[PDB]
Symmetry: D2
């Protein structure tokens, strides 16, 4: 599993469950092609998005539908979504965890890159 997404709720102190996540790769045409998506589990995590064969170097975008999450809780949010855009670079066996911590008017995101 070369790419995992984890989403946390800073208002409830809980995993953010049932959040839609979409992953795009930048094409040679310089446009966003979708290629993976899912919803976060009870633990706030989304696994199995891609494989080591498919997850080649390139520019990637991870979109997290935070607005629908806050609306589901009856909280009016600021952002339409959280967007994380990054370059995947090969330099050894690497796994990427994209974490996002959500509040109605703020989010944080960090990348944890590790060699198994």
């Amino acid at each position: 599993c070369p790419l995992m997404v984890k989403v946390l709720d800073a208002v409830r102190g809980s995993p953010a469950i049932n959040v839609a996540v979409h992953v795009f790769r930048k094409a040679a045409d310089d446009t966003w092609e979708p290629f993976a998506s899912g919803k976060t589990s009870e633990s706030g995590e989304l696994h199995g998005l891609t494989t080591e064969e498919e997850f080649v170097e390139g520019i990637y975008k991870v979109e997290i539908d935070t607005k629908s999450y806050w609306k589901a809780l009856g909280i009016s949010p600021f952002h339409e979504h959280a967007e994380v855009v990054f370059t995947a670079n090969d330099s050894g066996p690497r796994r990427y965890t994209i974490a996002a911590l959500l509040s109605p008017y703020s989010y944080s995101t960090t990348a944890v890159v590790t060699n198994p």
Copy 2:
């Protein structure tokens, strides 16, 4: 000043100076059209992007070119940029401050929204 952007550097404990910022507005045909741009000052602030008359209801995207900032400091960061997408003035006109706190592999963004 209905829209202001402030950027801070979490590694140096300083404003993030001379950071490029681009603002887009979603058009009728669901394309992003350029709206304003500038660079952060010595205080990390970018003022004067727009006016109350031109900052109409809409969906806006603020792109902060964090990658060029970290590269100017010798650091190869994770993200291509920090992005904030939001609906503006949906309840009449306000004052929006978009703040970003930057680290090489992480950023936060917050909105402080006050009544004019």
Copy 3:
């Protein structure tokens, strides 16, 4: 103003107003002695805590009473307070801004340090 504290509310997208802030300095006998206190203004800022003459080298603790803030809003938060402990002026006198961004189960704190 060598020391300023700014507090933001990540749930409401607003300054955190009327938040109690206490500053301590570590004494010769390794006890914390009270140094200054105040409440954040309508802008979320607390100025005038100390002077350049009294803000000598030392170890300082800034306690932000986040729990009473969230409780005034009807929210039972996780943390008792947000705390920042740092060594000050170890390289001559500077200007310190301590910023805190608050959520019920999370907070961030940052220091922006500028030369006088």
Copy 4:
């Protein structure tokens, strides 16, 4: 495992490894009694701090020695440490994860509380 601590490095995009963590409980005398400590693993995590029998309701402090971590990397940091102070409340089977994301001049901390 009712209490786990996880520490992340926002500059390197990695777990923060070998970070000292100390846990204190507030005594009836209103003073901090130490009762658990350790160092974060290769995954940035510290498990086995306490048991369900010992982790009773009370006020707890988790101290994370961030200054020694940054010094070990040759980076001059702002904070002496990160301190998380909270009330543990019984209301069903609860597990607490205290997460901290570290930068030299900033840290974030969040609590993830879950029912297994």
